[PDB]
Homo-oligomer: A and B are copies of this chain.
Amino acid sequence: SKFEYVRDFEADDTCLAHCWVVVRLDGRNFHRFAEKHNFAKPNDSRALQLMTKCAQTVMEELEDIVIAYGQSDEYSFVFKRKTNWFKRRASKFMTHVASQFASSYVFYWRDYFEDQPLLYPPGFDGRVVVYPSNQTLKDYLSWRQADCHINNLYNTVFWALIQQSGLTPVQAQGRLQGTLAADKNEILFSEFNINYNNELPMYRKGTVLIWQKVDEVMTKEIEMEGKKMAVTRTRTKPVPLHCDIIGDAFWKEHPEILDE
C-alpha cells in the first residue's frame, strides 16, 4: 500500500499477566450535568439506578468481569486476573467499557428519568489500574466505598443545613469545616432528628454487582398497560447488592470471585 508503515507506530499496552485489571469510570463535568438535569441532593435514586443499569450492560456485553462497584458519578469494573480477552491490551479494556456505558446511559435514560428530559449527551472519563495481589484489589475497592461513605455523610448534613436550616453553601461549608464523623452524625441527630444509619444502603454503601444464577424474568409494563410478561433470560445475571465490602464478611460469602 506504501502507507501501511504507519501501523508500526502503534505502541503496545499489554497489562501485566496474572494481575487484576480494573477500569474506573467518572462522569466528565457531572457537576454541571447534575445541575442542568435537576438532580436530587444529597442523592438522586434516578441517577444512581441508571449508572447501575449501564454497569450491568457493560458486564453482559463484555467478558470476564467478576465484580463491579459504583458510587456517585463513577463505576469500577474488575476483570479476571487470568483473562486474555483482548490479549490484555489496556486500550481495549478502557474504550469498550467507556463506550458501552455511555451508550447505555442515553439508551436507558427514559427508564429512570421519566419526566426529566436529557438535554445533551454526556461524556465519561476512564482509566486502567493494574493490581498484582488480591489484597491490593480488595484495598482499592474498600477505598472506593470509604470514599462513598465519607462523601455521603458530609453531603447529607451539608444539604440539610441548606434545605432545612436555610444556610448558604458557603456558611454550611464553614460550619462543617474541621468537624469529625462523630460530629456530623450528632448534628444530624440533634438539629434535624435524622439517623444516618437509617438512610438507604444504596447511598451509604454504594452498589456492588456480582454474577448470580437466574431462572426467568417478569418485567412490569409501563397507554393502559401494567401487567408482567414472561421473558426468557440468561441462566446468570449481575445483581445489585448494597453491602459492606470492606469487611471479610462479603468475601467469605462469595469466595468464587477471587479464587477462580
Contacts and interface: CB of A to CB of B under 8 A. Distances in A.
Interface size bucket, A side? 35 or more
Total identical chains: 4
Interface in A86-140: 90-92, 94-96, 98-108, 118, 120-133, 136, 139-140
Interface in A1-15: 1, 3-6, 8-14
A83 interface: no
A4 B9 CA distance: 26
Contact of A95 (B9, B127, B139): B127
23 contacts: A3-B142, A3-B146, A6-B131, A6-B136, A6-B139, A9-B16, A11-B129, A17-B132, A18-B132, A25-B95, A28-B96, A90-B91, A91-B94, A91-B128, A92-B125, A94-B126, A95-B95, A98-B102, A99-B125, A100-B123, A102-B103, A103-B121, A108-B121
